[PDB]
Design a binder for this molecule. Structure first.
Ligand SMILES: CCCCC/C=C\C/C=C\CCCCCCCC(=O)O
Ligand SMILES: CCCCC/C=C\C/C=C\CCCCCCCC(=O)O
Ligand SMILES: CCCCCCCCCCCC
Ligand SMILES: CCCCCCCCCCCC
Ligand SMILES: CCCCCCCCCC
Ligand SMILES: CCCCCCCCCC
Ligand SMILES: CCCCCCCCCC
Ligand SMILES: CCCCCCCCCC
Ligand SMILES: CCCCCCCC
Ligand SMILES: CCCCCCCC
Ligand SMILES: CCCCCCCC
Ligand SMILES: CCCCCCCC
Ligand SMILES: CCCCCCCC
Ligand SMILES: CCCCCCCC
Ligand SMILES: CCCCCCCC
Ligand SMILES: CCCCCCCC
Ligand SMILES: CCCCCC
Ligand SMILES: CCCCCC
Ligand SMILES: [K+]
Ligand SMILES: [K+]
Ligand SMILES: [K+]
Ligand SMILES: [K+]
Lengths: 257, 257
């Protein structure tokens, strides 16, 4: 009966969390949204009036441009899709369950292969992350024992603090490279790092997509390394926080009578 | 030395997997990509000649349209963002790490809150999925014991088969709708189900945004239920497959001496 009670309590807490978050986000974003929509409508009206065009023609043109944009066409000089390097980027985003969406299959045959490829490849990456976490815990224990100088395993709190510090350092080091090379601010770089590392992958900000990219040989390698390390660290941090949340739920159940 | 060897072997296998997958995907998709680009170029040239507009003016108009699209505007009628139910959909996509990208924060203050909200909310959903898997295993053992009529826990193989059957049934039941209600083909519905359930979330196909949606009260509830069950089942299946892959890695290590 304890497991059922814990399950029900967690479900209720998540429901309340979702409701509160929805209210807060709506209150934060509604005015901005409405203002942006009004600005777009004014711009569209001005363009239509200036060049004496018709709305239906503009709707057809925009539908064609929407089709072209899913094909892959952009307005500022993007790198080609479905070359070997682009395919490598795509499969890397697939196996990590990031799913930026900048590149998607469009043919029958590439979607069946997409399904089978993901079905065979995502568990391997999950196992790799688990093995990385185990190795990191072992090396942390060994380092601590050597510094003090088996039974020297660190507690969960210290592992959480170390993972937080590592994540902060990795994010600030990746941002220190993203900000100059891209046209991004430091806060935007940190936001992109958080969105990519947590495997949410909104897709609004994607790096390394500007055709000629200066040196472009070391830059792609550095991007790959940074994303890999960040994803590993954030995965481990989330697992530790989940363990702590389970302990807190147990305490909440015990206190209530 | 066994753990290091297993880590190295898994890394090498994943690297080879990525290379082969990139080569296959590129060979599958390059011709379609080139044909789509040529079609878009021809359409743009025909519009330009049709109405004698200069290229730069069209580039500016398309940049404005991209900015508008980043705020939610589409050529078809779509539901509003951030009212109260769009926010609920957004937070649901956030906590499950799906990240469709149809709705993203655009203000300073909504991005800090996004970071903290995700940091506190993703581990809770991970814990919920783990508890669901434990409860499912327990109930499966109970049903098996009752049918035969503690030590009656099923093997990993049978759990994998049952999870596969449940995933297929849930996908087919969800695809029974989504097909007439949204103009989608059955194969497209199955592809969308796989992409959403695995928490990849490309965002090319997103369900339940067409402004007026007939009943629209029961339909949203059914969509919520279907996505929740599918994500749970696919998460459990991936964990079981990861366990099997680890066993296979141990076997190949033993064979290589
Ligand atoms: C040592 C290998 C271990 C296995 C790696 C596992 C998962 C892959 C992780 C992250 C994907 C990173 C995105 C690819 C970047 C390509 C670089 C570029 O072209 O810009
Ligand atoms: C009751 C158990 C609580 C646990 C829920 C946990 C995570 C939420 C997961 C998936 C929700 C996906 C978003 C679907 C919302 C659609 C609603 C609409 O169409 O408007
Ligand atoms: C620019 C590199 C793209 C091809 C990917 C392979 C090289 C980097 C990773 C190799 C690690 C062994
Ligand atoms: C139409 C759905 C409105 C948004 C909130 C719905 C909450 C109902 C599902 C969970 C109740 C336990
Ligand atoms: C230790 C690596 C971090 C330093 C890289 C800074 C790059 C700044 C110039 C783009
Ligand atoms: C122009 C600088 C871009 C390359 C960054 C070098 C980092 C490589 C070592 C990790
Ligand atoms: C649970 C089985 C019912 C789901 C399919 C309903 C079909 C809906 C479209 C008419
Ligand atoms: C018209 C279809 C509306 C959805 C019916 C399904 C509701 C029960 C699902 C459990
Ligand atoms: C007897 C407890 C039932 C729990 C139902 C939970 C629904 C998600
Ligand atoms: C196009 C050059 C990259 C080829 C990959 C090399 C892997 C060893
Ligand atoms: C010998 C232990 C290997 C751990 C290395 C971790 C690399 C970041
Ligand atoms: C084009 C230079 C490739 C740099 C990556 C090689 C690292 C082993
Ligand atoms: C000597 C142990 C192997 C470390 C190589 C790094 C693996 C990514
Ligand atoms: C628990 C009831 C919540 C109702 C949400 C608002 C309905 C429009
Ligand atoms: C003993 C109650 C378990 C509930 C499982 C519900 C699965 C939908
Ligand atoms: C508008 C009808 C609401 C449907 C939700 C049912 C509550 C369990
Ligand atoms: C936090 C309770 C919900 C209030 C907004 C509908
Ligand atoms: C799988 C070997 C490499 C394929 C050609 C780049
Ligand atoms: K995702
Ligand atoms: K995504
Ligand atoms: K994900
Ligand atoms: K996405």
């Amino acid at each position: 009966n304890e497991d059922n009670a814990r399950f029900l309590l967690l479900a209720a807490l998540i429901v309340l969390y979702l409701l509160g978050g929805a209210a807060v986000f709506s209150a934060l974003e509604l005015a901005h949204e409405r203002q942006a929509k009004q600005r777009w409508e004014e711009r569209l009206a001005q363009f239509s009036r200036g060049h004496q065009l018709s709305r239906d023609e503009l709707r057809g043109f925009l539908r064609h441009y929407e089709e072209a944009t899913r094909a892959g066409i952009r307005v500022d000089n993007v790198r080609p899709r479905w070359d070997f390097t682009g395919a490598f980027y795509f499969v890397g985003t697939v196996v990590s369950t990031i799913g930026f969406g900048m590149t998607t299959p469009a043919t029958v045959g590439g979607k069946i292969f997409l399904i089978f490829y993901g079905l065979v490849g995502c568990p391997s990456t999950i196992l790799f992350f688990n093995l990385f976490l185990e190795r990191l815990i072992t090396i942390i224990a060994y380092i601590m024992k050597s510094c003090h100088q088996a039974g020297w395993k660190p507690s969960v709190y210290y592992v959480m603090l170390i993972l937080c510090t590592a994540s902060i350092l990795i994010s600030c080091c990746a941002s220190a490279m993203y900000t100059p090379i891209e046209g991004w601010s430091y806060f935007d770089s940190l936001y992109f790092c958080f969105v990519a590392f947590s495997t949410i992958g909104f897709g609004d900000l994607v790096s390394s997509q500007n055709a000629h990219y200066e040196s472009q040989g070391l830059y792609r390698f550095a991007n790959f390394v940074f994303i890999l390390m960040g994803v590993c660290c954030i995965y481990s941090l989330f697992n530790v926080i989940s363990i702590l949340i389970k302990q807190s739920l147990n305490w909440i159940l015990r206190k209530m009578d």
